[PDB]
């Protein structure tokens, strides 16, 4: 007579978990390097950058969900302190492999067809719903095979599994002091149909591109010993002693 409704996969996986986080600078980028974010960042939307949602979504082989992207923008100041600004941010949704902008004020941000969302810091966080956009009927979470017809393709990375790019910029111009604008993206998968459950991953992750494994140096969660050791098979660790 116990309710089993909390272990539903629609309830199990629909936690709005952190999927992206960049503290990028917000200043005069006339003298900054090429690798640094010049008031914008692209992010290829993947479930794999943070290991807690990843291990939950890697419990299944095939997932059919609607990503409910919630973008939490928060701001800090890089000697003296002044008031935090009410910065307007654009988060333009670019598809996989399409043209992502190269500047803050480039003419790709006009969003003549791309889905953008113009939100502020002092507003509630920008929550959009990105649909099930796989060309297949489910996201191949694990894709045993290769994408390209040649033999140079990446193993495990099906581009149909890839959601897309989330190009996020600050709509405001540069201001005479530098701010550190941290953009946290929270994806809540919903309308979830889950197929083919898998062994939960025990060893720690190495990369987001694959399923490489190293393990800890000692038990628990080591390669030769996943479960932590005890004395003998007839030795009870948490034994009651009275």
């Amino acid at each position: 007579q116990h309710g089993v409704s909390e272990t539903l996969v629609e309830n199990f996986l629909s936690r709005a978990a952190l999927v992206s986080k960049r503290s990028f600078e917000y200043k005069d980028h006339t003298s900054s390097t090429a690798r640094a974010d010049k008031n914008f960042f692209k992010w290829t939307i993947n479930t794999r950058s943070f290991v807690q949602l990843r291990r939950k979504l890697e419990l299944f082989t095939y997932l059919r969900f609607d990503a409910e992207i919630t973008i939490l923008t928060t701001v800090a100041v890089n000697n003296t302190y002044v008031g935090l600004p009410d910065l307007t941010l654009q988060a333009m949704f670019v598809p996989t492999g399409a043209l992502t902008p190269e500047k803050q004020d480039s003419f790709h941000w006009q969003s003549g067809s791309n889905a953008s969302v113009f939100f502020k810091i002092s507003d509630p966080p920008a929550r959009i719903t990105i649909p099930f956009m796989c060309i297949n009927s489910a996201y191949s979470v694990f894709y045993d095979g290769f994408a390209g017809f040649e033999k140079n393709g990446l193993y495990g990375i099906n581009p149909a599994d890839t959601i897309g790019n989330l190009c996020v910029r600050i709509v405001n111009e540069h201001q005479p002091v530098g701010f550190t604008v941290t953009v946290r993206v929270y994806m809540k998968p919903k309308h979830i149909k889950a197929w083919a459950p898998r062994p939960p991953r025990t060893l720690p992750y190495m990369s987001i591109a694959n399923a490489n494994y190293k393990g800890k140096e000692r038990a628990p969660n080591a390669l030769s010993a996943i479960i932590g050791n005890r004395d003998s098979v007839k030795t009870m660790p948490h034994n009651i002693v009275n």
Partner: peptide, 18 residues
């Protein structure tokens, strides 16, 4: 929760009815 004032069927809440 039955509030879905959007024209898209995927935009609804998480269908936790089972």
């Amino acid at each position: 929760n039955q509030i879905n004032f959007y024209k898209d069927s995927y935009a609804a809440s998480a269908s936790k009815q089972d």
